[PDB]
Design a binder for these strands. Structure first.
Ligand SMILES: [Ca+2]
Ligand SMILES: [Ca+2]
Length: 757
DNA sequence: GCGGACTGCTTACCA
DNA sequence: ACTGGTAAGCAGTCCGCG
DNA sequence: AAGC
C-alpha cells in the first residue's frame, strides 16, 4: 500500500521517496533513476542544437538541458512530434522553461508545471492505497487560553487530547484529578510528552478537525517560543505548512495528516460546521460546547478545570470517530484519482478530474494541454446556455409521476462522442451535430473523455456484480464507495469542460451537451402533452413532473410506464428516461421551489425556505408545519391557526433565541465586498476586534429590536443575552415567518396581513 | 419630498 | 474554487404623484 | 526548502 511520494536532493540530484505500508511494516523505497522533463514543439528539428545550448541560473548555478530525445505523441487526436527535454533537478524546469518558450525556434512547451513526486506516480503507473492494509490512526485536539485581541500564539496550549481505538487521554500542566487526565511539570514537557506518545504509538494517520489552520499552526508557534524540535515525521522531519488558495495545509512526512474539515465541507450541507453540529448530523448523539471565555475563567479560578478536560477528551474521541467514518471512502477516492489521500481529501472536483485525466493521458500517449495564462483565461470569461426550466403550473395537484433521464450529460458525451479531439475534425466520414450551437462531432474514432466515460460505466457494472457475489460486509462497503465515487467522477466531466482553468476546457463541448439536454427534455415534454394524455406540471434540466387531469393513481402509473416503453427505443445510445416515483399530491410554488407527498406520507421539499440555512428555524419550522397541513391533511384552516400561533408567540417574546439564528457564509476577502448586508456588517465588526474571517466562514447572527438597516442591529448569535438584548419580534414576524408561509398561502388567496396577529 | 417600485449585489439552493 | 438557472433579502436608487 |  503506497501512502505518498516526495523527493529529496543528494549532492544536487533528486531522489524519489515512496512511502508504503507492506505486510504490517512501514517502509521508504528510494529511486535515484527518475529524471524531470517537459516537452517542446519546434518550428524545425535542425534548431534543437540552439535550444540545447539555452541556459539559466538557479541559486547561482548554471542550468542547461541535460539531454533531448524526439518523441511521437497525440495532441487532441492528431499525431504530433515534440522534443522531451530532460534536466538534472526538477527545480531546473521553473528556472529555464520561460527562456526555452521565449526562444524563436520553439512554438510551445507542455507539461512543465507537473510536481515531480506526482510525475513519478503517473509515469511509473503507481496507484496509492492499493490492497487491504490495516492502518493505525491517532486523532488529536488542543485547548488554548484565548483573550480577545492577542496575536495567534500568545496564549499557551492548556491541554493536548488524543484518541485511538484503545484509549482517549488528555496531557495538561494543571492539577486536574481524573482517570484520563495526565498532569505534568510545564507546557514544554506537555508538548514533549505528546511527541513521545506519537513516537511510541507510531500512527500511519494523524486526524485533526481544522488542524490545517488552527491546531498545527499553534504547535509550530509554541515550539518556536519554547525552542522544541517538533519532529512528528517518520523520517524525523517537522510538519511543513503549504499554501492552498485562501487556506493553508499541514504535511507530516511518512504519516497522513487527515483534516476532516475540508472533507466534511465537500460532503455534507449543514447550517454550521462546528465539531458539535457535525457529530449530531453524522452519528445523531448530542455534544456539549465549552467556550474560550468560560475555558479561561475555569483555568485561572481552577474550579471548572475538570469540566474543560471532559470537553478536550470528547473532541479527540469524536474526531477519531469521524476519522474512522470518512477515511475509508477517501482512501477509495485516492485509488480512483491515483493521487495521495492527503492531496485528494483537500482537492475540489476540478483538480480531481484533472489528475485523473493526466494519468489516463500518459497511458494513451496523449500530450496534455497547458493551464491557460491570464490572456487565455480572459478569453474564456463568457458563459453559455444551460438547462431548460419550464415555468410550473402553480398550485395543488393530484396523482403526479416524476420521470427523469439517467446520467443525461454523461449519456450525451458518450452517445454523441462530445470531445475536443472530435470537434470539427477534418474529413470525418460520419458526424453528430449539436441542435442550436451547430458543433460537428466526429463518430469515426472514439474521443478521449467519451472513451474514459465508457470505461467508467463498464467498470461500475463489474463492481455492482462483485457486490452481489461477496459475503464480507466490509469489502461490500468498500466496493459501494468505489462505484458511488465512479458515478460522481462521471457526472463531473460536463462541468470540467466548462471550467475556464481546465486543461481540457472546451466551451463548444459544454455548449453542445446542454443544447442536446434541452433538445431531449423539450422533445419528451412535447411528446408527453401532444401524443399522450399528460399535462407537464414542472420540468427542470433532466426531469419532469406530469399528471393526466381526469385520471386516477393506477391509470397515471400505467400510462407513464407505457410512455417509457414507447420513448426509450426512439432515444439514441444510452439516453434512457426512467420512472423515479409517484406522488399523491404536489405543490408547485415557483421555479426550483415545490413539495410532493408519496403514498407512504413522506413529504419531499425542494428549494423552499425549509432547506435554506439563511432563514431562521422559526420561519422554516412554521413553513414545514404549514406545508404538512396542506400536503398531508387537507386543512388550509389548520395552516392559518399555525401562522397566527407562531406570530403571537414572537409578539410576547416567548420563542427561544436558538430558533432566531440566521446563517450566511462569507465567500470572499472582506475588502472585496461592494454591498454590506447583515452577515458582512457582523463579519467586519468581528474582524475589527481581531477575529480570523476566512472565505468559507459561516456568520450566525440575530436581529435586535430597533428601526433602520438590519445590519445595524445584527449581533453574533454567541453574544445575544436576554437580560440586556431584546430580539426584533416585528422583524421575525414580517421579514422571516409571514413571507415564508405567504409563498404557500398566496395560492389560496390569503393576504400577508390576514395571516398575522 | 414621499413612499413604493425597481435593481444590483449576494446567497444558497436545483439539476 | 465543476457548470448554468433561479428566487429572494437587503440596501441603495428611481420614479410616479396631481 | 520553507512561509508570504
Ligand atoms: Ca422528486
Ligand atoms: Ca435508449
Amino acid at each position: 500500500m503506497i501512502l505518498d511520494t516526495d523527493y529529496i536532493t543528494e549532492n544536487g540530484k533528486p531522489v524519489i521517496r515512496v512511502f508504503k505500508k507492506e505486510n504490517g511494516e512501514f517502509k521508504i523505497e528510494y529511486d535515484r533513476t527518475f529524471e524531470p522533463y517537459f516537452y517542446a514543439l519546434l518550428k524545425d528539428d535542425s534548431a534543437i542544437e540552439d535550444v540545447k545550448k539555452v541556459t539559466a541560473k538557479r541559486h547561482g548555478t548554471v542550468v542547461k538541458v541535460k539531454r533531448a530525445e524526439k518523441v511521437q505523441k497525440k495532441f487532441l487526436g492528431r499525431p504530433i512530434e515534440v522534443w522531451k527535454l530532460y534536466f538534472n533537478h526538477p527545480q531546473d524546469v521553473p528556472a529555464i522553461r520561460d527562456r526555452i518558450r521565449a526562444h524563436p525556434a520553439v512554438v510551445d512547451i507542455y507539461e512543465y508545471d507537473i510536481p515531480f513526486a506526482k510525475r513519478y506516480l503517473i509515469d511509473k503507473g503507481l496507484i496509492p492505497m492499493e490492497g487491504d492494509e490495516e492502518l493505525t490512526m491517532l486523532a488529536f485536539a488542543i485547548a488554548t487560553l484565548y483573550h480577545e485581541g492577542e496575536e495567534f500564539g500568545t496564549g499557551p496550549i492548556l491541554m493536548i487530547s488524543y484518541a485511538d481505538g484503545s484509549e482517549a487521554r488528555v496531557i495538561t500542566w494543571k492539577k486536574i484529578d481524573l482517570p484520563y487526565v495526565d498532569v505534568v511539570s510545564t507546557e514544554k514537557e506537555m508538548i514533549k510528552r505528546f511527541l513521545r506518545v506519537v513516537r511510541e504509538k507510531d500512527p500511519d494517520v494523524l486526524i485533526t478537525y481544522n488542524g490545517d489552520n488552527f491546531d498545527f499552526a499553534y504547535l509550530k508557534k509554541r515550539c518556536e517560543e519554547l525552542g522544541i524540535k517538533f519532529t512528528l515525521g517518520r523520517d524525523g522531519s517537522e510538519p511543513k505548512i503549504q499554501r492552498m488558495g485562501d487556506r493553508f495545509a499541514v504535511e507530516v512526512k511518512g504519516r497522513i495528516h487527515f483534516d476532516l474539515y475540508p472533507v466534511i465541507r465537500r460532503t455534507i450541507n449543514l447550517p454550521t460546521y462546528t465539531l458539535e453540529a457535525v457529530y449530531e448530523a453524522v452519528f445523531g448523539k448530542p455534544k456539549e460546547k465549552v467556550y474560550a471565555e468560560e475555558i479561561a475563567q475555569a483555568w485561572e479560578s481552577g474550579e471548572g478545570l475538570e469540566r474543560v478536560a471532559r470537553y478536550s477528551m470528547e473532541d479527540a474521541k469524536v474526531t477519531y470517530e469521524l476519522g474512522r467514518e470518512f477515511f475509508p471512502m477517501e482512501a477509495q477516492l485516492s485509488r480512483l484519482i491515483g493521487q495521495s489521500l492527503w492531496d485528494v481529501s483537500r482537492s475540489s472536483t476540478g483538480n480531481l478530474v484533472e489528475w485523473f485525466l493526466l494519468r489516463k493521458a500518459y497511458k494513451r500517449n496523449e500530450l496534455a494541454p497547458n493551464k491557460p495564462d491570464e490572456r487565455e483565461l480572459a478569453r474564456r470569461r463568457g458563459g453559455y446556455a444551460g438547462g431548460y426550466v419550464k415555468e410550473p403550473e402553480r398550485g395543488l395537484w393530484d396523482n403526479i409521476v416524476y420521470l427523469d433521464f439517467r446520467s443525461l450529460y454523461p449519456s450525451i458525451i458518450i452517445t454523441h462522442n462530445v470531445s475536443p479531439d472530435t470537434l470539427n475534425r477534418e474529413g470525418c466520414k460520419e458526424y453528430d451535430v449539436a441542435p442550436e450551437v451547430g458543433h460537428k462531432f466526429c463518430k469515426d474514432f472514439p474521443g478521449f473523455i467519451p472513451s474514459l466515460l465508457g470505461d467508467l460505466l463498464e467498470e461500475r457494472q463489474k463492481i455492482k456484480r462483485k457486490m452481489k457475489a461477496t459475503v464480507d460486509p466490509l469489502e461490500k462497503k468498500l466496493l459501494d464507495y468505489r462505484q458511488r465515487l465512479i458515478k460522481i467522477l462521471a457526472n463531473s466531466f460536463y462541468g470540467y469542460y466548462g471550467y475556464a482553468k481546465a486543461r481540457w476546457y472546451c466551451k463548444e463541448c459544454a455548449e453542445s451537451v446542454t443544447a442536446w439536454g434541452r433538445e431531449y427534455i423539450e422533445m419528451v415534454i412535447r411528446e408527453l402533452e401532444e401524443k399522450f394524455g399528460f399535462k407537464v406540471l414542472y420540468a427542470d434540466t433532466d426531469g419532469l413532473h406530469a399528471t393526466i387531469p381526469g385520471a386516477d393513481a393506477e391509470t397515471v402509473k400505467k400510462k407513464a410506464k407505457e410512455f417509457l416503453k414507447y420513448i426509450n427505443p426512439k432515444l439514441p445510445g444510452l439516453l434512457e428516461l426512467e420512472y423515479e416515483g409517484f406522488y399523491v399530491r404536489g405543490f408547485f410554488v415557483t421555479k426550483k421551489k415545490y413539495a410532493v407527498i408519496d403514498e407512504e406520507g413522506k413529504i419531499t421539499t425542494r428549494g423552499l425556505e425549509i432547506v435554506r440555512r439563511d432563514w431562521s428555524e422559526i420561519a422554516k419550522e412554521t413553513q414545514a408545519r404549514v406545508l404538512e397541513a396542506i400536503l398531508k391533511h387537507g386543512d388550509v384552516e389548520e395552516a392559518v391557526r399555525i401562522v397566527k400561533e407562531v406570530t403571537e408567540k414572537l409578539s410576547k417574546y416567548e420563542v427561544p433565541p436558538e430558533k432566531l439564528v440566521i446563517h450566511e457564509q462569507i465567500t470572499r476577502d472582506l475588502r472585496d465586498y461592494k454591498a454590506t448586508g447583515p452577515h458582512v456588517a457582523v463579519a467586519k465588526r468581528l474582524a475589527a476586534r481581531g477575529v480570523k474571517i476566512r472565505p468559507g466562514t459561516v456568520i450566525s447572527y440575530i436581529v435586535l429590536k430597533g428601526s433602520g438597516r438590519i445590519g445595524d442591529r445584527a449581533i453574533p448569535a454567541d453574544e445575544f443575552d436576554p437580560t440586556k438584548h431584546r430580539y426584533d419580534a416585528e422583524y421575525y414576524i414580517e421579514n422571516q415567518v409571514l413571507p415564508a408561509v405567504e409563498r404557500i398561502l398566496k395560492a389560496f388567496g390569503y393576504r400577508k396581513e390576514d395571516l398575522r396577529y
